[PDB]
């Protein structure tokens, strides 16, 4: 719903507050989201590179 | 009994819990320590 990105999506085990959509890291990069339809938190890890 | 404050443009330092809630803060224009 607006957040555009790339990466691997994975089942999370963090708990947002029930009005927060996505989570950010220190240095300010999106690293978790909440799925609008099912309302579950998913981590966003980058794509294997090197 | 009721109160009315007003809001100004300030800069704060918010401390976030591990669940993601704000538990403490610092107003950075109060005094030299802040």
């Amino acid at each position: 719903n607006g957040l555009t990105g790339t990466g691997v999506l994975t089942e999370s085990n963090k708990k947002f507050l029930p009005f927060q959509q996505f989570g950010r890291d220190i240095a300010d990069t999106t690293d978790a989201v909440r799925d609008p339809q099912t309302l579950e938190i998913l981590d966003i890890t980058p794509c294997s590179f090197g | 009994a009721y109160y009315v404050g007003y809001l100004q443009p300030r800069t704060f330092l918010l401390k976030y819990n591990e669940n993601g809630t704000i538990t403490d803060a610092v107003d950075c224009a109060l005094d030299p320590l802040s």
Binding site: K14, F16, L17, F19, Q20, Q21, F22, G23, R24, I26, A32, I41 | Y3, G5, L7, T11, F12, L13, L14, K15, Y16, N17, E18, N19, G20, I22, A25
Partner: peptide, 24 residues
């Protein structure tokens, strides 16, 4: 009358989760 707030009127500036991070 007038009174003194102490530490009152702090709101979450927006969505986006977050944990232990003295964010400015």
């Amino acid at each position: 009358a007038y009174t003194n707030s102490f530490t009152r009127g702090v709101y979450y500036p927006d969505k986006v989760f977050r944990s232990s991070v003295l964010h400015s």
